[PDB]
Structures are given as C-alpha cells and as structure tokens.
Amino acid sequence: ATSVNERIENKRRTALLGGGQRRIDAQHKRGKLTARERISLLLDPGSFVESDMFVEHRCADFGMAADKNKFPGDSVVTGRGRINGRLVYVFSQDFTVFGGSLSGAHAQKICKIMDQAITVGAPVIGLNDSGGARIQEGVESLAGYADIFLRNVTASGVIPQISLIMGPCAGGAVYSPALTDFTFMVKDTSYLFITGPDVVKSVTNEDVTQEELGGAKTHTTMSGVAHRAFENDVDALCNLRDFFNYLPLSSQDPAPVRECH
Amino acid sequence: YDPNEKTFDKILVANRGEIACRVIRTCKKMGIKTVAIHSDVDASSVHVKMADEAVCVGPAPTSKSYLNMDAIMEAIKKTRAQAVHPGYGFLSENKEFARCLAAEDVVFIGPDTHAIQAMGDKIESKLLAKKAEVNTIPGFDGVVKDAEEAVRIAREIGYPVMIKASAGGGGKGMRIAWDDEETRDGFRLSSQEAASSFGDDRLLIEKFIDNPRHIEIQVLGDKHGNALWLNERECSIQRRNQKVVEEAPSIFLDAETRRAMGEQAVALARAVKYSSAGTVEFLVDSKKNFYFLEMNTRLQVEHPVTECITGLDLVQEMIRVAKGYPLRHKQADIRINGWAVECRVYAEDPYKSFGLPSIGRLSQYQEPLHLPGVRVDSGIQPGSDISIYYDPMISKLITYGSDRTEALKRMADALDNYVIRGVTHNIALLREVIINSRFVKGDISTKFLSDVYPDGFKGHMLTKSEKNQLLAIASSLFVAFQLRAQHFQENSRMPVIKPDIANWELSVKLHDKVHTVVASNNGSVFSVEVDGSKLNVTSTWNLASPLLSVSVDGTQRTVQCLSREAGGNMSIQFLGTVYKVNILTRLAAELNKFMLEK
Amino acid sequence: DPSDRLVPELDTIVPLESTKAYNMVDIIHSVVDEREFFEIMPNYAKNIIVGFARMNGRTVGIVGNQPKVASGCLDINSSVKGARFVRFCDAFNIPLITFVDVPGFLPGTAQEYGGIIRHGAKLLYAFAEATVPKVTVITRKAYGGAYDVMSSKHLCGDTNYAWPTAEIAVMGAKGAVEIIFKGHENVEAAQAEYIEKFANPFPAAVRGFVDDIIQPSSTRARICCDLDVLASKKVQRPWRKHANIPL
Numbered sequence A: 001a002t003s004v005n006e007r008i009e010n011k012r013r014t015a016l017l018g019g020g021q022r023r024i025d026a027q028h029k030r031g032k033l034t035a036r037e038r039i040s041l042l043l044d045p046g047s048f049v050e051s052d053m054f055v056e057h058r059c060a061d062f063g064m065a066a067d068k069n070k071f072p073g074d075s076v077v078t079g080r081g082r083i084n085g086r087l088v089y090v091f092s093q094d095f096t097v098f099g100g101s102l103s104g105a106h107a108q109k110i111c112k113i114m115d116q117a118i119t120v121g122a123p124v125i126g127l128n129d130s131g132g133a134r135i136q137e138g139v140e141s142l143a144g145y146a147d148i149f150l151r152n153v154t155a156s157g158v159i160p161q162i163s164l165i166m167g168p169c170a171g172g173a174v175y176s177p178a179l180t181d182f183t184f185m186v187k188d189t190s191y192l193f194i195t196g197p198d199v200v201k202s203v204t205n206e207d208v209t210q211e212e213l214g215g216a217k218t219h220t221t222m223s224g225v226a227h228r229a230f231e232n233d234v235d236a237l238c239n240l241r242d243f244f245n246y247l248p249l250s251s252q253d254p255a256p257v258r259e260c261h
Numbered sequence B: 001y002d003p004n005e006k007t008f009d010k011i012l013v014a015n016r017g018e019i020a021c022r023v024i025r026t027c028k029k030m031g032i033k034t035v036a037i038h039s040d041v042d043a044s045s046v047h048v049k050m051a052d053e054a055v056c057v058g059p060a061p062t063s064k065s066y067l068n069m070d071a072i073m074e075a076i077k078k079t080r081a082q083a084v085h086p087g088y089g090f091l092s093e094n095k096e097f098a099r100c101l102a103a104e105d106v107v108f109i110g111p112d113t114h115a116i117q118a119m120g121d122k123i124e125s126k127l128l129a130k131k132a133e134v135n136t137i138p139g140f141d142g143v144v145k146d147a148e149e150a151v152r153i154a155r156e157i158g159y160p161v162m163i164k165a166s167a168g169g170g171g172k173g174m175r176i177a178w179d180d181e182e183t184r185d186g187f188r189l190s191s192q193e194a195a196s197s198f199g200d201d202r203l204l205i206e207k208f209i210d211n212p213r214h215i216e217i218q219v220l221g222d223k224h225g226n227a228l229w230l231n232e233r234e235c236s237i238q239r240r241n242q243k244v245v246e247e248a249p250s251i252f253l254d255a256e257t258r259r260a261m262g263e264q265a266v267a268l269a270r271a272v273k274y275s276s277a278g279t280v281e282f283l284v285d286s287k288k289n290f291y292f293l294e295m296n297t298r299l300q301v302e303h304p305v306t307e308c309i310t311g312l313d314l315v316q317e318m319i320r321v322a323k324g325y326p327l328r329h330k331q332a333d334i335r336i337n338g339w340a341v342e343c344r345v346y347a348e349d350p351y352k353s354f355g356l357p358s359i360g361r362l363s364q365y366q367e368p369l370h371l372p373g374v375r376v377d378s379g380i381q382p383g384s385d386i387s388i389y390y391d392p393m394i395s396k397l398i399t400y401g402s403d404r405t406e407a408l409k410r411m412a413d414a415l416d417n418y419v420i421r422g423v424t425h426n427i428a429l430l431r432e433v434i435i436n437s438r439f440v441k442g443d444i445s446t447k448f449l450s451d452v453y454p455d456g457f458k459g460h461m462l463t464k465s466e467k468n469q470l471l472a473i474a475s476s477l478f479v480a481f482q483l484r485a486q487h488f489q490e491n492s493r494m495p496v497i498k499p500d501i502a503n504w505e506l507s508v509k510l511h512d513k514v515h516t517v518v519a520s521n522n523g524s525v526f527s528v529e530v531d532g533s534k535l536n537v538t539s540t541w542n543l544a545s546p547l548l549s550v551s552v553d554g555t556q557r558t559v560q561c562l563s564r565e566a567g568g569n570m571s572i573q574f575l576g577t578v579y580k581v582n583i584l585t586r587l588a589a590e591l592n593k594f595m596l597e598k
Numbered sequence C: 001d002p003s004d005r006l007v008p009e010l011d012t013i014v015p016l017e018s019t020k021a022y023n024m025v026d027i028i029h030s031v032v033d034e035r036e037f038f039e040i041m042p043n044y045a046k047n048i049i050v051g052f053a054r055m056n057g058r059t060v061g062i063v064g065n066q067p068k069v070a071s072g073c074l075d076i077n078s079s080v081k082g083a084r085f086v087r088f089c090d091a092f093n094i095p096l097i098t099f100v101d102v103p104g105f106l107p108g109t110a111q112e113y114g115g116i117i118r119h120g121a122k123l124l125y126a127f128a129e130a131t132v133p134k135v136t137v138i139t140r141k142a143y144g145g146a147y148d149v150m151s152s153k154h155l156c157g158d159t160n161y162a163w164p165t166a167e168i169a170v171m172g173a174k175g176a177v178e179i180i181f182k183g184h185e186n187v188e189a190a191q192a193e194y195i196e197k198f199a200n201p202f203p204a205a206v207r208g209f210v211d212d213i214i215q216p217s218s219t220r221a222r223i224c225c226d227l228d229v230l231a232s233k234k235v236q237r238p239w240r241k242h243a244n245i246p247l
Ligand SMILES: CCC(=O)SCCNC(=O)CCNC(=O)[C@H](O)C(C)(C)COP(=O)(O)OP(=O)(O)OC[C@H]1O[C@@H](n2cnc3c(N)ncnc32)[C@H](O)[C@@H]1OP(=O)(O)O
Pocket: A098, A099, A100, A101, A102, A130, A131, A132, A133, A134, A135, A136, A142, A168, A169, A170, A171, A172, A173, A196, C144, C145, C170, C171, C179
C-alpha cells in the first residue's frame, strides 16, 4: 500500500544526503564539495540522469549487515548528462560514505556506466574522492578494482577518459586515473599516493607529509603524473567544462569544428 | 617375517635420516605400528611420511630436538608406544636415556645400561677385554696426566706412539707422535682440545700399528646367553678416520682367522653379557695379527652388507631379542652367500680435503633402483634440503654379487646411473676408489686415500682411448643438439629449407689442449674422427633425460650433461668425473683467435 | 621432455615463514622444458624476472616475481621491464606464464617522485590488453593492487592456479585488523581470527577467483594441458587506431 511509496521516498531522501548531514558539514569545513554538488556544477542544468540510486553493498562480515551500515548509492553517484549539449557519462565518488572506499556495488555502478558509455560512444569523466578499497569487503573489492581497470584498457583509444582528483585518493584508487587520457588535481585538497606517510615512516624511515608525498604540486611539477592543477573545486569544474569542448565524443568522430570569428 | 609371532604393537623411532626409514620399513613389514619424531625443518622428511604417526620434538638444532630427551619422553607418553628404537648416534649409547626408559614400562631396543657404560670408555673397555682373554693393542693401562709420563710411556712402548681421547668418538682427539718432543707437545695439545670439546681430559697412550686393516665382526646376542658372530666386514678405506667404502666379506682373511676372530668376539660379548646386536672392531696388521679396538654397543651404520651376505634382517632380530624371544639361528647356520660392497654417498666436495661438507637443496634426485643387485638406503627425496645441523650424508649404496668382481662392476654401474643435482657429492672419489688397481687387487690399508692421492683427489686421469671416447661423445651430443634445433613444425606460409650439411668440422678444447673433430651423422649413428682416430657412437639421443646411454665402438657408456651453453661450453659427467669442454665450429674457432682475452 | 613430468622438488620450495625468501628461477627451471631458460635483463631490476622458454616444444614468455631481491616488491624499473616484455609477447602471439609472489609496491619518496603511479600502470595495462593465452600461478603472496597488476583473473585471464601456500588479501593481516578494529581496540583474538579466515587461498577460491588449488608437483603438467586447449583462443575488442598507454 502506502508503505512501499513511503519507503521509496525515505530511501530517496537518504540517498540525497549520502552518509549524513554531520559528515556533509565535516566535508564542507574541509573546503570541499559533495559529489552531487560537483555533478550539478559540472553538467548542464536539468540534464543529469542518475542510475543505480538504490544500490547497496552486499557485504555481511564485520557487522556490515546492520541497518546503520546500509547507504543507498554506496559512496558513488553515477549517471549521464550533457556539457554544452554534448553527451557525457559521469561518476562522482562520495567521501561521506565509508570514506569513499570502493566496495562491490561501487565498482558495479562504475562498470555499468563505463559499459553504457562505450556502447553508445561517449566520454567518461570521473571525479575521484576515494579513500581506497573497503577492507571489510575483502578480495571482492580487489576484484572490483580489476574490473574497472580492464574496462579502462578496453576504452583506451575508443572514448576519451578524463579524471579529476578532488580528494585523498590512496591505495588502489590511483591506477584508474593513471590509465585515463588526462588527469587533473585540485590544489591543497587532492592527494595521490600508493602508500601513506605512516607506512613510509615505518619502512623507509623518513618524515614527509601528505602534501609533500602526493600533493598537487608534487604531481604537477616533478612527478609528471597529473596534467594541471586548479585553485578549488569550482574553478576546477569550470576549467573541466572548458576543456571538454575541445575533445571529440569518440574516435569514430572527427575533430570538433566550432564557429569562428 | 612371521605375523603369528607377537612382538610389540607400537615402536617409536627416536632418530632421523635413512636409519629411521630402514627401521620403519622393517617394522611395517613385521606389522608393528610406527611413530616417528622430527624437528620443525624435518616436517616433510621421508621418514615422517613413511610412519603412521609423527610428533614434533622441537626446533632445528639437534641439541633441542633429537637430544631433547624430555620432549621424547612426553612423545612416548602421549603416543603410548611400547618400544623405542634409537638407531645409531644421538641417544643410542646414552646410559641416562636407558635409565629414563627403564623408569617407565616402555622397553629400550638395544644393549643393557651396564653393557653401554662398560664400553663407554676406552681404558675400561681395554681392561675388560684383556680380562676377557682377547688380544689387545700394546700400551700402558691407566690415565696419563703429565707430559713427562706420556713421553716415558713412549720410551717403553717405542717411538711410534698414538695419543687418543678417552671415550669421545667420531674420529676426533686422535693423533700420532713420532718423537719424544712430538709426544709431549701433542699430549699438551690433546689435553687442550679435550677440554675444549670433550671435557673429559682423560687420555690414552698406545702403539700405532703400521699399515693396519679395520676388520669388524658383527655379533648378535639374545637375553638367554646365546651369541653368534655372523661374519666380518672390512672398512679400511677412510678419510678423517671415517669410513666411506665398506666391504662385507674380507678378502684379506681366510677361514681360520675369521673363525678365531668370531670366537674371540663372542667370548668378549659373553663376558660383557651383551643382549643385542653390536660390532667388535679389530686392526689386523700385515702378519695376520688382530688386536681389539673399541666395541660399538649399537646398530652399525654399515650393517646392510652383512645382511646381504647372510640373508638376515638385523633390525628384526634386535626387535625379537628385545621382546624376549631366543635366537632362531645357530652358529653353523651362518654362511657366506656372495659378495657385498657399500659406498656412502655424502654431500661433500671430494676435491677439498677428501670431502668438505656442503649445503644446498636437491633439485634432481634419482636412484638406480632398476640396476641389477642394487640396494639404496636413503632418507632423502627430490626437494630435500641439506642443512648444517645434521650429518651431510646423502645415501648408502649397496651392491651384491656372486663374487668380488661382479659386485664391483654393479657398484660402478650404479654409481654411473645415480643422479644428484643441487649439491656437490663425492661420487667421483667413490668410483676412483672402486676402480683403483690396488683396491681391485686387495692391498688396502687405513691410509689408502692418503698415499694413493698424496696431493689430494684430482679426478679421473683419463687415458688416450677414454679421451677419444669422451671427445667423440661430446661432439656427437653437440651435433645432435644442432640437428634438433632445425626441427620446426610446418608453417605452410614460409617453408623451412633444412641446411644440408654432411660433415661438421669442430674444434674441441679440453683441459688445455685443442683437438680437431670431423663428425658425420647417418641417422642414429655418428661417425667421429678425432685426430685421425675413427669411432662410432650410437644412441637414442634423447636430449631431455638426465642420463644418456651411448655405445662407442661396442663399449657401453652412461654419461650426464650437467650444463650446456650457446657459446659451446658443456660440463659432462663421464666415468664419474665432470669434464668441462668447449666445442666451436671450425670457422668460429678460426675467427676466435682475434678476440682479446679479458 | 614429457609434458606430464612431475616436479616433486617444488612441494617444499616455498618456506613456511613469510620472512624467508626463495628463488623463483628454481621454480622456472623446474617447470620449463629441459630446464632451459633465456632470461632478459638478468642484471637489471632483479626483483622481476622475464624471459623465453619452451613448454611441450612451444615458445612461451615467462614473467615472475623474485622474492630474493627487495622481497619481490614492484618498482618503476621492474614495472617498465615486465611491461615491455609482455607487450612484445602479446604482439607476436607468444603465450604468457606468470608466477606471482608480491607484497605490493615499493614505498618511499624516491618511487613517488619518480612517477611510480604511471610506471606501475604500464604493467597493469600490458597484462590487461593481452589477448594471447595467459596462465597464472600464485606461489605465496598477492596483496593489494599488485594482485590485480600481476595478471589477475579479472583482467580476462585464462587459467589462474594457487599453491597451498598462496595468500590473496586486500593487505597484510596486521594493517587490516588495525584498520577494521580500531574502534573495538581488541586485537587479542582479532589477529587469530583474521589469520585463520583470510590468510589462506580459500576466500579467493570460494569466489572463483582461482580455478583450483593445485599441488606444486603437478604445476608443469597443469600448465601444459592448458597450453594445449588455449592455442585457439580468439577474442574481439572494439576498433581503434591505437590505444593510449601511460608511457
Ligand atoms: C588495493 C587497494 C588498497 O590497498 S586500500 C589502502 C587504503 N589504506 C587506508 O588506510 C585507508 C585510508 N587511508 C588513509 O590514508 C586516510 O584515511 C586518507 C585516505 C588520507 C583519508 O584522509 P582523511 O581526510 O583524514 O579521512 P578519514 O581518515 O577521517 O576517514 C574517514 C572514514 O573513512 C574510513 N575509511 C577511509 N578509507 C577506508 C577504507 N579503504 N576502508 C574502510 N574504511 C575507510 C575510515 O575508517 C574513516 O572512518 P571514520 O568515519 O573516521 O570513523
């Protein structure tokens, strides 16, 4: 009766807030936007179509089957939209839910978006704000990463792939951006390193901060991993919209031609 | 092997290696359940797999695993074993171990504590043997404490003198003095290393027999007083005062002397009241005079040869004696049947001090079990690890025959057909010993290795005919590899035009000489011309098998290709010795003269 | 050289202690035909091993981790070397056999400043686009993204086998326990439970990430049969002029 409708509305409202209002406030205090605000700023207004909004993780170990550990969407917002009228597929990682760690559902949603994009021949833009792989998931998480990796290599040279790191990407969350065509970072809020400073101190025995180890300056001036760095999220998204206008939608299409004066 | 005879039902083998495997095999044949102790590193050994139950007894070192008497006691208590078999070494001759076993109801398979303690020290053993109307080595009875006393003893017993550490064993604390100053300084040094390792500081001064022969008599006695002397064994070939080649029937001994020595050994055993299997060792001089020297109150390492020549199972006999049953054989029933020779394959490098212990992991291991008249006692397998904690002995190879010549021929065949890859072994030394002219004749003493190889072992000094055979085999193998390199599957797009070459002209560098070789192939037969000499080599030319059997001019030879490189270097084990040859083509040999030496 | 030859010397080659290191060249020599191996770059980036060998007479390319050097960890040089070797073997229809024993990637600022991310992505890409038959055997360890990089089943791998000493996990047991039970702050039985349930090849086996847990002595045979049935492997991929490898 009305129970199904009220549950649908409750799940929609919960998915809109991610992992809670307190963690949203914590994210805002860090000078960062949420995944949905990033998607809204990147895409044309009123053009976002979201997929897999109600998908939840299927893990049962370490007390992850409790209702307090179930978040519809599972730390990723995936869908399609338009930039200046041209189709694009987008995923944005939600640092609010489990630190954006990749679970099975996370990888399943990303893989679905990538598969549909390669089916229709449209670019993929990925906003990376992941803390790594979900440890409670176990080897499943690893498998998920590998799946994404495969699709990246399958999509290389077929559709353009753009990565924008907007948070502390660590562990295995650093290899998908490396497999894409272009990689951009945000100053003072984005990081890229396989192992954190603590492990470096434990093994190598040297004192480095996160900014020195994997900051935007490090990866844009001497590492050679990232291509450009921007002041903040709004500036980065505006420049990403500007940069997207140059590229063609697929390798089947010629170089874009615009109106000239 | 009568199952009706009711022996024990559970026996713990408190040992490792090949002796544990042999005891387990005998018990399994008799039907007794076997339990084997092991260390952490020996968790995957052969004897633990062959046993029905296994119990870890500690870490890798022997002082905490196999000499850990307490853990062995809790292993016995947990497994509720009825008998214990120590094999040889470790706790085989430990009186306090015997007391611990006698504390409980579990029986110790071996001699009694009184017999072990009687023969635990050399001076008391010599005194008892003299009281037992047995010929003893001339010397002074007692303990020497000062250098002056030792040199005085050297005065009355002659300038050739030997200083020996009391008890101990293992060929240590035993050296020779030729002069009075040598006597005193050697005595002081012997006290020094006695304090260093043995700790007894008790020394014996006696006479050195010149050109002696080590002849052992295997005695077997029950608890009812019966005692048989079985037959003898010869163990003259030694280095570091340790046997490496043993020979069951003595070629130096006739029937009368053998019978006299056996009767003397039986008399000594009855005087000691020995109630197990043991050995009495004598040193026979050139004039067929024997003197008593030590008595091992345990199972001998080289026991399988007397088993082969007598058709007995010593482990079964000791088990039956421990159970309490009387001996089922009489002295007249003992007879010599054929001939037997045993070689100890060690993990040592024979080129350094006649064998220097080596370590490593066995990558390939194959025994010649299919060869006629071959028995292998080994506790290792492919993938086994030779560690520093235990005795670096790989295997014991026994060959029996109708006579000495057949046994030696089968021994040579087995040594040629025995594959070890991963470590260094002394197979070359064993083959050179068994094919030596003096050894074949029989004129061997305890210093055979010292005087046969005064400068140390150098390998096989191959003659001209053998050199030509080796060169022909190497050239044929090289040409066979080259021919196999040209066999591809059909491509159907770019067909392969096989290069039609009739004669291969090669330059073979061996030692420091260079030989010109012309090789021709007629299918499975190679005609090889080396420096004019013509030879024919035929074989199946299987290039993957570790052993390759070829026929050079009718003579059959088994060789191994240990290494091979594209530059022409090959290591070939031939006649037991590894030769490194370098084969180049004639054009390559000519062009190589312009290369600068590094 | 028979294709069903057993290799019993591999049954105990991997030590029980994870600290002890073995030599992977011994495994490679035991498995391949006639124990003949043509190694490429033998003196450079020695933590990885690449080379050519033969199985049942057919040319194969071998890539493996070397636990002797740097405990088998991956770095920039080894990644580049293995990536180019794999690319050549895939380009010329040569099957690939991989032996995996890797704890992860080498940490430090030297690796990060040198571009460890982009160089490590090269090997992952090379294994991912390969369309030749590929057979993977995990010997001791496969941790983190290194497990995915070293020719995992999810990269369109053909056959993946694990020895009874294999350990496929997201990371080490200690780090996982301290990252999961930080609130619980009770690592007394946490270590025991985690090592009993996750320090074994079973979690990957029950999800079908490895086809089988084979005895080491059968390894060669298990490979050869596979190379018999995968010789006719054909896959189809989307059209492109060329892809964009992270060079
Ligand atoms: C093969 C793939 C891999 O190897 S994954 C290796 C990832 N190693 C980790 O330690 C995970 C997180 N590592 C980190 O270095 C930091 O947390 C980073 C990523 C820099 C985040 O920085 P920070 O701004 O301080 O966020 P935070 O520490 O407050 O984390 C908030 C909550 O998110 C969680 N989180 C994060 N990552 C994971 C993960 N991989 N698996 C499970 N949970 C994760 C944290 O537990 C944390 O929980 P809480 O809400 O603060 O209680």
